[PDB]
């Protein structure tokens, strides 16, 4: 798995590959790892698919019940609920989740929650097996307050390299753009990103 | 450890060594391996020291509650079975116990029950428990008679512990003697094995192998 | 029972004549990966106490929330919350020490080593240690992890016993701490150049210094070192 | 403990059980009676792990004695054996199972027939003309298979039992210190004091 | 290949003489004079540095050799044979003594070891 | 795997006199080959003229001492401020220890004080609660180095009277508090020389009818 | 299981004024079982004395080995081996079995016949030399011996005073060890006389 | 154990503590850890004490034979190469960890050697259980172009850090100074900061205190004449 | 460890960090991992220091004896000798070596020899624990026929990132330049490369 | 095998050795002689792992018989025991060690003294007035310590030996099927056929 979330001027973009493996067999080559817990709060999932699906479903439930009572939750609040589940059940979970969301007050925010269940607010985050190969590239190429087109290129180039080197990653590059304008899904195929 | 107890004409003799070891290290030479449950009942300590201590003083509390409620001395059978039923509840948890519950009542006469942390409860005439038990058994079996005098019986128990104290590396220090009668137990002193060995060697002519 | 995932390395500290100093780098390691470079591991409680934490970061964040909650709770129905009935370093430590030992006794420890540094109401210096086992001890100098092996020897040359504390100024104490942090950067593979330092003085109060860097490093001699024995070029 | 044998003859059941009690390196006792009277015409011998054997036997005894008082009636050997089997079958899936094997020798006063039941610690019940537990059967069954007849007298059964014990004493490595023999018939339970 | 000379090249003649040993002694007789004198507080050994050519640096050719810090040796006869014997004598002082007893051998025992090596070249194949 | 136990080193020594008792212990606290503290008090005044030390794993040591001090406090509340006698304290500590029989306090506990006749008393406990009154007891890291010396110099073991040649033992004459303190100091000085975990400082608590007194002495810091 | 503590036993050596002392217990056992009360652990080759603790078969084997080697030494050297030289021989001999060692704790004691200097030395099972001025200890009660020696020992003791010190060090150490005791022997060694004394002790 | 090596202007210095231990017990309180490979090549050892002694004597022996064979004074790189190839062959089973220092016609040298056969070059090095305490001092006070007097001070201060802070190290400081164009000076017990204080009591027994069974004269002399 | 070798127009450059660790302790912070087996054939060492030192010393011996008989060896020949040792003794070695050399006929060549003992001729090679983090960066930034100054910058930037993320790597960045002109050693200190 | 005892009296050495050979769950033999005559006045009993015991004993026998022929002379018991010890000491560091414990009872014709040597599989030799191997000593040594005198007659030694065997038969769990007793004295070796 190769996943990342990047804040930019107009908000935040989540990116992910689509490969799910059982050993060396690709069980699903068109997986959707970008999952929605609220209208403009999404997450990238890595680790145990069962665990991360179960967690996400519980978070979506919590934020739906939160919204019914207290109105739209913050991205920080969503990250807190993720953390609470991951931290308290750390012995029985293998989950590495990046939380990304768009408020109007706070704008684009990215939180990463690694295996232990800690929370780290960052300008951008990378995770999954393929992330190891792009720590150098992403650190050298990331800038704050990029445009939408620049951020899409940054994510596309980054995950392209992660896919190139990581056997556990591959397929299509899915992306979800979170801004004031709304929610936009993007997809990029092998013939496009491999030649980069 | 070496502990023994045997029934005879004059009641019960209880004899124990005094050594406690942690590996090769001799932790103590002055350990009390006879628990005075009450003035009429005695228990021996082998295996786990605390397990024997704790649960046999607890047993004394249960015996006291029995005779308060029933207005009558508890039988050795009943006292031993309270302890055995207790340790049986703990079976598997890792209690370590090998003890003789000794007493002398009207209805039973002199009685000895071997009680075990595996839940074993055996009535018997002669029992020997500990790392030096085999050495004590030899002296006991070859010299034991029902019609022993209280004086000779006390010596036999003392001599049998000495036999074990000499050969068994994890037994020694001193010998504690008790004589259990119907009216209660009687303590017959602490006997240093070092001084006892030379005394017995000379007077008895035994241990010719050893130079003195 | 768990294993630590995201970890923080050495916390070092020492007493001086009017108070205590404590320091710790801003790194959150992920095994050999130097993952997070902006982690604050010194957490102040009020204006008289600083708790320095090493080990598992997720457990550190949990402890951070317990201390935040402790301040809130102390203020409840307490008119003297900012005066006579404010939280002391000794109260904060004893609470943590209780929690650490309880958690180890349930076979589910907070995987940390903690140093509580502060100044009491009567001006006395407070410096005490507690870890995942609930083991506690106090000393003129205290350090966790690699700091124990490399920082303590250096800090003990300044304050070797109790009688050396009044003779040690804040400038000398801070100098020793900063030098110790440089030594740890040379020699600890799980350390970073960026660190935070906190001074708690009975007169000037709590001074919290962020974004400090290890400087005045010696590397020039490396150019002359060639091969591993016989090689000349 | 070690060896327990059982043989059902014409008009009685004979149970033979070893006297030795070994605790590790030493033989602590050579006169132990590994049996309990459950009712006037029902006897149960037992062998297995230390403590569990006697604890289980006495527990069964108490339950059958309780039934006898409540109903003023003695349960049939078959009924007693089924009760015992269920307790052992219940035990095998417990937190800490009873490690006890038993033989139940009884005389059914209604049917006027002797009955021998063999039950192991798993709750495996079988009605047999003769039975054993552990390694005892390995040495004795070939002799019993050869000599046994359903119309044997009590005296003939005891002679065949002596031959079984002699074979055990010859070929078994362990010294089990002889056996206590008991006979269960229409008149009740009695011990053969010379064997 | 293989050393197929597994038999003695030194043997007793009818008269009881060991020819090769006598002939070796003849070679020693042709060799340059060397001597030794023992005093009460020391020993001296000496020889002539017979230079084969004046262009040769006779300092590089050491006829007198240190065997141990307290033992020295000088010879007469074939120089190359001496040189290898010195190498073996130095090594045997370590392998069969210093590495066992943690000290250098006494003169007589080192001499004994050198003698053994020379005896073996008188009997071996 | 998580190991809930640790070894904090240290060595303690309790000696019962005729009308006094001493409980001594070094002040060094360690893990592995590192020193945590050169002065970390190990012997404590628990009130009612009782002194205590729980040596071994310091977390369990502190926990036990804390619970016993607590037990002394509640004994006063429940029983009209009655003084907790040393024998009663000893039995109470057994139950505290045996309470955790299957997850023990990893310590070797010693208490000291005076019995109800005013004579010197020392009690010694194993980790799981087996206890016993003793005249002399060293505990901890250098216990094996100290006890044989005490057998010889306190109880006069293997010492006979000159001229008799093994026939008459050296008589067991009573030692003063000044004489005991000398043997304690020499025990710890010797232990410091030959045991790496022993050193830094020696703290001695002396119990008499007048109360509890403290004495401190330096030890080698290497 | 542990070869160095199956048979049990101890050796201690001390230096004094113009003298050395070496002492040992007499016990040989099979773990808990006492087998022999006459198993002496001190041997001598000329004026050099060697104590050996540990596995009893190796104690016997090494004694036979050093007798062998010191006998050949004497025939070739035409003199008795010295303590300093013998110490190096013991070290060399043990280390040649580096990856299959004798499970022993040797102790050398003696006086150099030429210089008159008292000498003691100890080794681990693998050959490392411990050349202490004061004392050397070995065996299953080595901790106890370290404690006794450290407190009891003082330098420049006269032969008859040194005897009392080493005897009391051994006896009280052995009485705190299950696998040591059952008698004891003390050698008092001077430049040209050696006295051997058997001690009376408790036999448990 | 704490051992260090420090380069200076015209040579190199090594130092070591003097405590050898058996587990938590101090076997020797004044052990000599500074060993001689050749007159001007010295080394300090940590780890398995028999292995460090054995491997230095073997290489020291072969170095002497090599020096005699080549008519040249021994070089540190030769000792280094022979040590590492020996240790590598035995794959760490010979538990020798050494700091090798010395002077030769090439100059002054300082190397470390680990048990598996890896070697390192440096201006300042430390090995043993107190190496971290010692290295802390070295990293705090080391500079280029140290004098002989400064290097001795630094080396011994680094050993002291180990003595006081490391339980595996203690007692005294041994030092050896190897300067170019000079005899190497071995300074046994250069510092003595751990003398035991006088005891409170004398434990000299009265004569006749010990019980004796038998006395006898031992015949140490040979078989006599006549 | 972070090591690499990069071919360029005038020849080849070897680069390496200087950190050697025993667990988390930095045993040597100024290690020289660029080792010489011949005048213009060097290697970068990763894995067991004892193993790679032993191998290099043996190779240097072989190439010295080769030169005495047959004249200067090729870089391919040196790589072959490395491979022969690594492959035949694969069960007892933990060595990851990059071989780099300059001929006049063949110019700059780089061979990598991973754990198994295989040989791979490449335009450039990266290896060591820190290499994982710069697969993306190096793949995106490498060009063939770079200048000396460009190649030095490429190596400096690459190892800077490897050092930044890998705790096992650090200290100074050592480099060795192999061209027709000769052999040039370069060193770059933390204050220089950290700010890149 | 199991139990081997030895006792040196005034003018002879007595060796007692069990007769049982138990291989598996069965006692295959009850008349096995666990001893070999090494020389006319030297007897060796043995116990340990199957095969190794007899292989070792016969190997020693052959070597001593070879020496006896070569020199036309009988080795002393001390000399034989030292040879045996060395072989076992050699064996313990071999690829597959002999798992054999032995007692060597001999009469030294030169010194006119009986001698008993105890040697275990490690090569641990001790000269004793009485000895045993395995668990045998645990049951018998307390009796021997009490009754033994160095001036005992052969008949008194046999009586003390009977008491030792009786104690073994009482307290040992294993049935060792009695003992074969042999006496070594100035006249040589003979077997006590009734015991
Ligand atoms: Mg110390
Ligand atoms: Mg003993
Ligand atoms: Mg004993
Ligand atoms: Mg290797
Ligand atoms: Mg780094
Ligand atoms: Mg034996």
**How far apart are the C-alpha atoms of B38 and B44, rounded to whole Å?**
13
Among candidate residues A132, A159, C31, A131, the one with its CA nearest the CA of residue I133 = A132
Tokens (6 digits) for G180? 């040591």
CA separation (Å) from H178 to C188, F192, H7, H41, J151?
31, 35, 10, 8, 74
C156 in Cβ contact with C12 (< 8 Å)? no
* Experimental technique used to determine this entry: X-ray
CA separation (Å) from C85 to C120, G89, I160?
12, 75, 52
Indicate the residue of H29, H169, H201 with minimum beta-carbon distance to F193. Answer: H29
β strands within chain A, DSSP E: 3-8, 11-16, 20-22, 25-28, 34-38, 41-47, 95-102, 108-113, 120-122, 124-127, 173-179, 182-188
- Residue A103: phi, psi to the nearest 5? -95, 170
Range I116-121 contact pairs with CB under 8 angstroms and sequence separation of 24 or more: I116/I87, I116/I90, I117/I83, I117/I86, I117/I87, I117/I88, I117/I90, I118/I83, I118/I87, I119/I79, I119/I80, I119/I83, I121/I76, I121/I79
**How far apart are the C-alpha atoms of I128 and I97, rounded to whole Å?**
9
**How far apart are the C-alpha atoms of J195 and J184, rounded to whole Å?**
16
Residue with tokens 């030959």: F194
Find the J138 Cα to ligand 2 centroid distance in Å. Answer: 18
I111 in Cβ contact with I127 (< 8 Å)? no
- Residue D149: phi, psi to the nearest 5? -135, 140
**How far apart are the C-alpha atoms of I136 and D5, rounded to whole Å?**
80
Among candidate residues C174, C171, C142, the one with its CA nearest the CA of residue C156 = C142
Which element (helix H / strand E) includes H167? Answer: none
Per-residue exposure over E78-98, b if at least 16 CB sit within 10 Å of its own CB, e if not? eeeebeebbeebbbbbbeebb
Indicate the residue of I31, I32, I50 with minimum beta-carbon distance to H116. Answer: I50
Per-residue exposure over E26-55, b if at least 16 CB sit within 10 Å of its own CB, e if not? eeeeeeeebeeeeeeeeeeeebeeeeeeee
Q: How deeply is H153 buried, as exposed, middle or buried, from its count of CB atoms within 10 A (0-12, 13-18, 19+)?
A: middle
Coil, helix or strand at residue G183: coil
Find the C230 Cα to ligand 4 centroid distance in Å. Answer: 21
Contacts of residue C139, Cβ cutoff 8 Å, sequence gap at least 6: C127, C129, F36, F37, F38, F39, F40
Residue with tokens 């402790």: C70
Chain I residue at shortest CA distance from H87: I50
**How far apart are the C-alpha atoms of J89 and J124, rounded to whole Å?**
8
Q: Report the side by side order of strands in the sheet with D130-132.
A: D130-132, D4-8, D12-18, D179-185, D188-192
- Residue H54: phi, psi to the nearest 5? -65, -40
Task: Count the Cβ atoms, other than its own, within 10 Å of residue G75.
Answer: 8
Q: How deeply is C96 buried, as exposed, middle or buried, from its count of CB atoms within 10 A (0-12, 13-18, 19+)?
A: buried
Nearest Cα of chain J lies from the Cα of D178 at a distance, in angstroms, of 12
Tokens (6 digits) for G81? 């081996």
**How far apart are the C-alpha atoms of B169 and B172, rounded to whole Å?**
8
CA separation (Å) from I109 to I95, I99, I122?
20, 8, 8
Collect all residues from A whose CB is shorter than 8 A from any CB in I: 132-140, 157-158, 161-162, 164-165
Tokens (6 digits) for E55? 């262009």
Could you tell me which residues are beta bridge partners of residue B190?
B176
Q: How deeply is F19 buried, as exposed, middle or buried, from its count of CB atoms within 10 A (0-12, 13-18, 19+)?
A: middle
**How far apart are the C-alpha atoms of G4 and G2, rounded to whole Å?**
6
Class in CATH terms, F1-222: alpha beta
A115 in Cβ contact with A83 (< 8 Å)? no
Q: Three-state SS string across F55-119, please?
A: EECHHHHHHHHHHHHHHHHHHHHHCCCCCCCHHHHHHHHHHHHHCCCCCCCCEEEEEEEECCCCC
Find the distance separating the first CA and the last CA of chain H, reported in whole Å.
Answer: 58
I95 in Cβ contact with I47 (< 8 Å)? yes
Contacts of residue J51, Cβ cutoff 8 Å, sequence gap at least 6: none
Strands D42-48 and D100-108: antiparallel
Residue with tokens 């210094």: C209
**How far apart are the C-alpha atoms of A100 and A36, rounded to whole Å?**
10
Tokens (6 digits) for B124? 């018997």
Chain B residues within an 8 Å CB radius of J148: 208-209
Q: Is E90 on the interface with H (CB under 8 A)?
A: yes
**How far apart are the C-alpha atoms of D127 and D104, rounded to whole Å?**
9
**How far apart are the C-alpha atoms of H113 and H126, rounded to whole Å?**
11
E34 in Cβ contact with E46 (< 8 Å)? yes
- Residue C132: phi, psi to the nearest 5? -55, -25
Tell me the angle at which helices G56-77 and G83-95 cross, rounded to the nearest 10 degrees: 130
CA separation (Å) from F66 to C175, F69, F73, F123?
39, 5, 11, 18
CA A62 to chain centre: 19
Chain G residues within an 8 Å CB radius of E112: 76
Helices and strands, counts by H and E, chain C: 4, 13
Chain C residues within an 8 Å CB radius of F4: 104-105, 107, 109, 133
Find the J169 Cα to ligand 2 centroid distance in Å. Answer: 31
**How far apart are the C-alpha atoms of E85 and E77, rounded to whole Å?**
13
Contacts of residue B41, Cβ cutoff 8 Å, sequence gap at least 6: B59, B60, B63, B74, B76, B79, B101, B102, B103, B185
Q: What ranges in chain F are assigned the alpha helix state H?
A: 58-78, 86-98, 143-153, 177-194
Indicate the residue of C1, C5, C36 with minimum beta-carbon distance to A115. Answer: C5
Class in CATH terms, G1-204: alpha beta
> DSSP secondary-structure letter at I83?
H
| Chains G+I touching (3+ CB pairs under 8 Å) | no
Question: Nearest-5° angle of CA G189, CA G195, CA G199?
Answer: 110
CA separation (Å) from H37 to A140, E93, F211, H128?
52, 17, 63, 20
Residue with tokens 């009687």: B186
**How far apart are the C-alpha atoms of E18 and E14, rounded to whole Å?**
10
> Between G and J, how many residue pairs show a Cβ–Cβ distance under 8 A?
31
> DSSP secondary-structure letter at H204?
P
D38 in Cβ contact with D105 (< 8 Å)? no
Strands B34-36 and B25-28: unpaired
Find the H213 Cα to ligand 3 centroid distance in Å. Answer: 21
Coil, helix or strand at residue H215: strand
Tokens (6 digits) for H207? 């004569």
Is residue H1 part of the annotated active site? The answer reads: yes
Per-residue exposure over B86-99, b if at least 16 CB sit within 10 Å of its own CB, e if not? bbbebbeeebebbb
B150 in Cβ contact with J129 (< 8 Å)? no
**How far apart are the C-alpha atoms of I44 and I23, rounded to whole Å?**
21
Coil, helix or strand at residue J89: helix
Indicate the residue of B84, B124, B137 with minimum beta-carbon distance to D26. Answer: B137
Find the C188 Cα to ligand 5 centroid distance in Å. Answer: 10
All structural domains of chain I: 1-196 (3.60.20.10)
**How far apart are the C-alpha atoms of G93 and I9, rounded to whole Å?**
63
Chain C residues within an 8 Å CB radius of F64: none
> DSSP secondary-structure letter at B168?
B
**How far apart are the C-alpha atoms of I188 and I186, rounded to whole Å?**
7
Which element (helix H / strand E) includes H132? Answer: helix H131-141
Active site residues of B: 1
Coil, helix or strand at residue F31: strand
**Size of chain B in residues:** 212
Nearest Cα of chain H lies from the Cα of F117 at a distance, in angstroms, of 31
Q: Do H64 and E94 touch (CB under 8 A)?
A: yes
Chain I residue at shortest CA distance from C34: I165
Ligand nearest the Cα atom of residue I129: 5
**How far apart are the C-alpha atoms of D89 and D96, rounded to whole Å?**
13
Q: How deeply is C127 buried, as exposed, middle or buried, from its count of CB atoms within 10 A (0-12, 13-18, 19+)?
A: buried
| Chains D+J touching (3+ CB pairs under 8 Å) | yes
Which element (helix H / strand E) includes H144? Answer: none
Fold of the domain spanning B1-212: 3.60.20
Tokens (6 digits) for I55? 């191998």
**How far apart are the C-alpha atoms of G106 and G124, rounded to whole Å?**
7
**How far apart are the C-alpha atoms of B206 and J143, rounded to whole Å?**
10
C137 in Cβ contact with C128 (< 8 Å)? yes
Q: How deeply is D188 buried, as exposed, middle or buried, from its count of CB atoms within 10 A (0-12, 13-18, 19+)?
A: middle
CA C181 to chain centre: 11
Indicate the residue of H122, H135, H161 with minimum beta-carbon distance to C187. Answer: H135
Tokens (6 digits) for F132? 């016993």
Nearest Cα of chain G lies from the Cα of J72 at a distance, in angstroms, of 27
All structural domains of chain H: 1-226 (3.60.20.10)
Pick the CATH number of J1-195 from 3.60.20.10, 3.40.50.620, 3.30.565.10, 2.40.50.140: 3.60.20.10
Q: Which of E101, E108, E116 is the best residue to mutate to test the G interface, defined by the most G CB atoms within 10 Å of its own CB? A: E101
**How far apart are the C-alpha atoms of H5 and H46, rounded to whole Å?**
13
Work out whether the CA dihedral I42, I43, I48, I49 comes out positive or negative: positive
As a whole number of Å, the CA-based R_g of chain F is 18
> DSSP secondary-structure letter at E95?
I
Q: Is B78 annotated as a binding residue?
A: no
What is the DSSP secondary-structure string of I113-149? E-TT---EEESEEEESGGGGGGHHHHHHH--TT--HH
Tokens (6 digits) for I137? 């960066």
Tell me the angle at which helices J77-92 and G56-77 cross, rounded to the nearest 10 degrees: 110
Tokens (6 digits) for A114? 């690694």
Q: Three-state SS string across chain D, please?
A: CCCEEEEECCCEEEEEEECCEEECCEEEECCCCCEEEEECCEEEEEEECCCHHHHHHHHHHHHHHHHHHHHCCCCCHHHHHHHHHHHHHHHHCCCCCCCEEEEEEEEECCCCEEEEEEECCCCCEEEECEEECCCHHHHHHHHHHHHCCCCCCHHHHHHHHHHHHHHHHHHCCECCCCEEEEEEECCEEEEECCC
Domain boundaries, chain F: 1-222
Chain H residues within an 8 Å CB radius of C229: 77, 80-81, 84, 111, 119, 121
Residue with tokens 């010694």: F124
All structural domains of chain C: 1-233 (3.60.20.10)
Q: How deeply is D169 buried, as exposed, middle or buried, from its count of CB atoms within 10 A (0-12, 13-18, 19+)?
A: middle
CA separation (Å) from I54 to F76, I66, I85, J20?
74, 18, 10, 62
Q: How deeply is H156 buried, as exposed, middle or buried, from its count of CB atoms within 10 A (0-12, 13-18, 19+)?
A: buried
Q: Within 13 A of F48's CA, how many CA atoms are on the CB side?
A: 24
CA separation (Å) from H33 to B88, B170, H161?
59, 41, 17
Q: Is C98 on the interface with F (CB under 8 A)?
A: no
Which element (helix H / strand E) includes H104? Answer: strand H96-104
**How far apart are the C-alpha atoms of H193 and H210, rounded to whole Å?**
37
H81 in Cβ contact with H51 (< 8 Å)? no
Nearest Cα of chain F lies from the Cα of B186 at a distance, in angstroms, of 21
Among candidate residues J43, J38, J2, the one with its CA nearest the CA of residue J173 = J2
Among candidate residues D110, D152, D132, D187, the one with its CA nearest the CA of residue D15 = D132
């Amino acid at each position: 798995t190769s996943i990342m979330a990047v804040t930019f001027k107009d908000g935040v973009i989540l990116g992910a590959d689509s490969r799910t493996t059982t050993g060396a067999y690709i069980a699903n080559r068109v997986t959707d790892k970008l999952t929605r817990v609220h209208d403009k709060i999404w997450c990238c999932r890595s680790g145990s698919a069962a665990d991360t699906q179960a967690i996400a479903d519980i978070v979506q439930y919590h934020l739906e019940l939160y919204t019914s009572q207290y109105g739209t939750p913050s991205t920080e609040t969503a990250a807190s609920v993720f953390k609470e589940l991951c931290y308290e059940n750390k012995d029985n979970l293998t989950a590495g989740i990046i939380v990304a969301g768009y408020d109007d007050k706070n704008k684009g925010e990215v939180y990463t929650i690694p295996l232990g269940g800690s929370v780290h607010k960052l300008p951008y985050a990378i995770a999954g097996s393929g992330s190891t190969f792009i720590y150098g590239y992403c650190d050298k190429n990331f800038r704050e307050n990029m445009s939408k087109e620049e951020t899409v290129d940054f994510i596309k180039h980054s995950l392209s390299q992660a896919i190139k080197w990581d056997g556990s990653s591959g397929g299509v590059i899915r992306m979800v753009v979170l801004t004031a304008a709304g929610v936009e899904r993007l997809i990029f195929y092998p013939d496009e990103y491999e030649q980069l | 450890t070496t502990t023994l107890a045997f029934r005879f004409q004059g009641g019960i003799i209880v004899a124990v060594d005094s050594r406690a070891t942690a590996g090769n290290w001799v932790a103590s030479q002055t350990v009390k391996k006879v628990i005075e449950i009450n003035p009429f009942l005695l228990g021996t300590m082998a295996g786990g020291a605390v397990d024997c201590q704790f649960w046999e003083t607890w047993l004394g509390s249960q015996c006291r509650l029995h005779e308060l409620r029933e207005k009558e001395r508890i039988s050795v059978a009943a006292a031993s079975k309270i302890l055995s039923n207790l340790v049986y509840q703990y079976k598997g948890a890792g209690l370590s116990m090998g003890t003789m519950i000794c007493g002398y009542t009207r209805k039973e006469g002199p009685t000895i029950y071997y009680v075990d942390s595996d839940g074993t409860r055996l009535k018997g005439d002669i029992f020997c428990v500990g790392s030096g038990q085999t050495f004590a058994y030899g002296v006991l079996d070859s010299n034991y008679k029902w019609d022993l005098s209280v004086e000779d019986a006390l010596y036999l128990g003392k001599r049998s512990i000495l036999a074990a104290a000499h050969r068994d590396a994890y037994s020694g220090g001193s010998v504690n003697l008790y004589h259990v009668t119907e009216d209660g137990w009687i303590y017959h002193g602490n006997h240093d094995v070092g001084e006892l060995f030379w005394k017995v060697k000379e007077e008895e002519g035994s241990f010719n192998n050893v130079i003195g | 029972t768990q294993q630590p995932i995201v970890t923080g390395t050495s916390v070092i500290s020492m007493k001086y004549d009017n108070g205590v100093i404590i320091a710790a780098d801003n790194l959150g390691s992920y095994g050999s990966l130097l993952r997070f470079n902006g982690v604050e591991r010194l957490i102040p409680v009020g204006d008289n106490t600083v708790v320095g934490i090493s080990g598992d970061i997720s457990d550190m964040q949990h402890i951070e929330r317990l201390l935040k909650d402790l301040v809130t709770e102390n203020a409840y129905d307490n008119p003297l919350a900012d005066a006579e009935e404010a939280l002391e370093p000794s109260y904060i430590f004893e609470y943590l020490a209780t929690v650490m030992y309880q958690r180890r006794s349930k076979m589910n420890p907070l995987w940390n080593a903690i140093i509580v540094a502060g100044v009491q109401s009567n001006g006395d210096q407070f410096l005490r240690y507690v870890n995942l086992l609930g083991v506690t001890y106090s000393s003129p100098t205290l350090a966790t992890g690699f700091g124990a092996h490399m920082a303590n020897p250096l800090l003990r040359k300044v304050v070797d016993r109790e009688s050396d504390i009044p003779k040690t100024t804040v400038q000398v104490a801070e100098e020793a701490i900063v030098n110790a942090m440089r030594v740890l950067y040379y020699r600890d593979a799980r350390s970073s150049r960026n660190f935070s330092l906190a001074i708690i003085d009975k007169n000037t109060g709590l001074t919290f210094k962020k974004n400090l860097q290890v400087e005045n490093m010696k590397w020039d001699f490396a150019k002359d070192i060639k091969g591993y024995g016989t090689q000349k070029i | 403990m070690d060896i327990i044998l059982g043989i059902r003859v014409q008009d009685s059941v004979i149970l033979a059980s070893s006297k030795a009690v070994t605790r590790g390196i030493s033989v602590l006792k050579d006169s132990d009676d590994k049996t309990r009277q459950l009712s006037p015409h029902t006897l149960m011998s037992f062998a297995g792990e230390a403590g569990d054997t006697v604890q289980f036997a006495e527990y069964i005894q108490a339950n059958i004695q309780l039934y006898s008082i409540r109903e003023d009636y003695e349960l049939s050997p078959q009924a007693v054996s089924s009760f015992v089997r269920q307790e052992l079958a219940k035990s095998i899936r417990s937190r800490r199972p009873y490690q006890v094997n038993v033989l139940i020798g009884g005389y059914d006063k209604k049917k006027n027939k002797p009955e021998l039941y063999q039950i192991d610690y798993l709750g495996t019940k079988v009605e047999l003309p003769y039975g054993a537990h552990g390694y005892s059967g390995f040495y004795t069954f070939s002799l019993l298979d050869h000599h046994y007849r359903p119309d044997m007298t009590t005296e003939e059964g005891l002679d065949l039992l002596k031959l079984c014990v002699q074979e055990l004493e010859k070929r078994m490595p362990m010294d089990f210190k002889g056996v206590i023999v008991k006979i269960v018939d229409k008149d009740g339970i009695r011990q053969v004091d010379d064997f | 290949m293989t050393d197929r000379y597994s038999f003695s090249l030194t043997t007793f003649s009818p008269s009881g003489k060991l020819g090769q040993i006598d002939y070796a002694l003849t070679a020693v007789k042709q060799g340059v004079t060397s001597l030794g004198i023992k005093a009460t507080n020391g020993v001296v050994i000496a020889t002539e540095k017979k230079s084969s050519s004046p262009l040769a640096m006779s300092e590089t050719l050491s006829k007198v050799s240190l065997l141990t810090p307290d033992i020295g040796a000088v010879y007469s006869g074939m120089g190359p044979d001496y040189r290898v014997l010195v190498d073996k004598s130095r090594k045997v002082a370590h392998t069969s003594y210093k590495r066992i007893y943690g000290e250098y051998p006494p003169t007589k025992l080192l001499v004994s070891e050198v003698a053994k090596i020379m005896q073996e070249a008188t009997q071996s194949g | 795997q998580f190991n809930p136990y640790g070894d904090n080193g240290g060595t303690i020594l309790g000696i019962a006199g005729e009308d006094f008792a001493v409980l001594a212990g070094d002040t060094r606290n360690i893990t592995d080959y590192s020193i945590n503290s050169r002065y970390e008090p190990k012997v404590f005044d628990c009130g009612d003229n009782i002194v205590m030390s729980a040596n071994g794993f310091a977390a369990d040591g502190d926990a036990l001492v804390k619970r016993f001090k607590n037990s002394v406090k509640w004994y006063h509340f429940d029983h009209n401020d009655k003084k907790l006698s040393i024998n009663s304290a000893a039995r109470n500590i057994q139950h505290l220890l045996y309470g955790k029989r299957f997850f023990p306090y990893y310590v070797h506990t010693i208490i000291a004080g005076l019995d109800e006749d005013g004579k010197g008393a020392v009690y010694s406990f194993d980790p799981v609660g087996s206890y016993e009154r003793e005249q002399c007891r060293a505990g901890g890291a250098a216990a094996s180095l100290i006890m044989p010396f005490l057998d010889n110099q306190v109880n006069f073991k293997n010492q006979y009277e000159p001229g008799t040649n093994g026939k008459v033992k050296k008589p067991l004459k009573y030692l003063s508090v000044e004489e005991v303190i000398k043997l304690v100091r020499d025990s710890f000085t010797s232990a410091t020389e030959r045991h790496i975990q022993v050193g830094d400082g020696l703290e001695i608590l002396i119990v008499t009818k007048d109360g509890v007194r403290k004495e401190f002495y330096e030890l080698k810091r290497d | 299981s542990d070869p160095s503590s199956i048979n049990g036993g101890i050796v201690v050596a001390m230096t004094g004024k113009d003298c050395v002392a070496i002492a040992c217990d007499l016990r040989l056992g099979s773990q808990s079982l006492g087998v022999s009360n006459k198993f002496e652990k001190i041997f001598h080759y000329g004026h050099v004395f060697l104590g050996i603790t540990g596995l009893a078969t190796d104690v016997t084997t090494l004694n036979e080995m050093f007798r062998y080697k010191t006998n050949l030494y004497k025939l070739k050297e035409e003199r008795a081996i010295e303590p300093e030289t013998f110490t190096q021989l013991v070290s060399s001999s043990l280390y040649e079995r580096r990856f299959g060692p004798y499970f022993v704790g040797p102790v050398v004691a003696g006086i150099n016949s030429k210089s008159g200097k008292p000498f003691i030395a100890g080794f681990d099972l693998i050959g490392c030399i411990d050349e202490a001025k004061d004392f050397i200890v070995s065996g299953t009660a080595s901790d106890q011996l370290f404690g006794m020696c450290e407190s009891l020992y003082e330098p420049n003791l006269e032969p008859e005073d040194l005897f009392e010190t080493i005897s009391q060090a051994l006896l009280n150490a052995a009485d705190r060890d299950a696998l040591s005791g059952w008698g004891a022997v003390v050698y008092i060694i001077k430049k040209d006389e050696v006295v051997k004394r058997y001690l009376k002790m408790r036999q448990d | 154990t704490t051992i260090v090596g420090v380069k200076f202007n015209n040579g190199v210095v090594i130092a070591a503590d003097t405590r050898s231990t058996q587990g938590p017990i101090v076997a020797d309180k004044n052990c000599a850890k500074l060993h001689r490979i050749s007159p001007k090549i010295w080394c300090a050892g940590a780890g398995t004490a028999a292995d460090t002694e054995a491997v230095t004597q073997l290489i020291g022996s072969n170095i002497e034979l090599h020096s005699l064979y080549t008519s040249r004074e021994p070089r540190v790189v030769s000792a280094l190469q022979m040590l590492k190839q020996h240790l590598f062959k035995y794959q760490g089973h010979i538990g020798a960890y050494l700091i090798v220092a010395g002077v030769d016609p090439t100059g002054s040298h300082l190397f470390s050697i680990h048990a598996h056969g890896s070697t390192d070059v440096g201006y300042y090095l430390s090995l043993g259980s107190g190496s971290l305490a010692a290295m802390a001092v070295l990293e705090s006070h080391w500079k280029q172009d140290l004098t002989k007097e400064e290097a001795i001070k630094l080396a011994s201060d680094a050993i002291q850090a180990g003595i006081w802070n490391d339980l595996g190290s203690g007692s005294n400081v041994d030092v050896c100074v190897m300067e170019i164009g000079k005899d190497a000076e071995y300074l046994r017990n250069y510092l003595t900061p751990n003398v035991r204080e006088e005891k409170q009591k004398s434990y000299k027994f009265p004569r006749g205190t010990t019980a004796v069974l038998k006395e006898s004269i031992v015949n140490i002399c040979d078989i006599q004449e006549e």
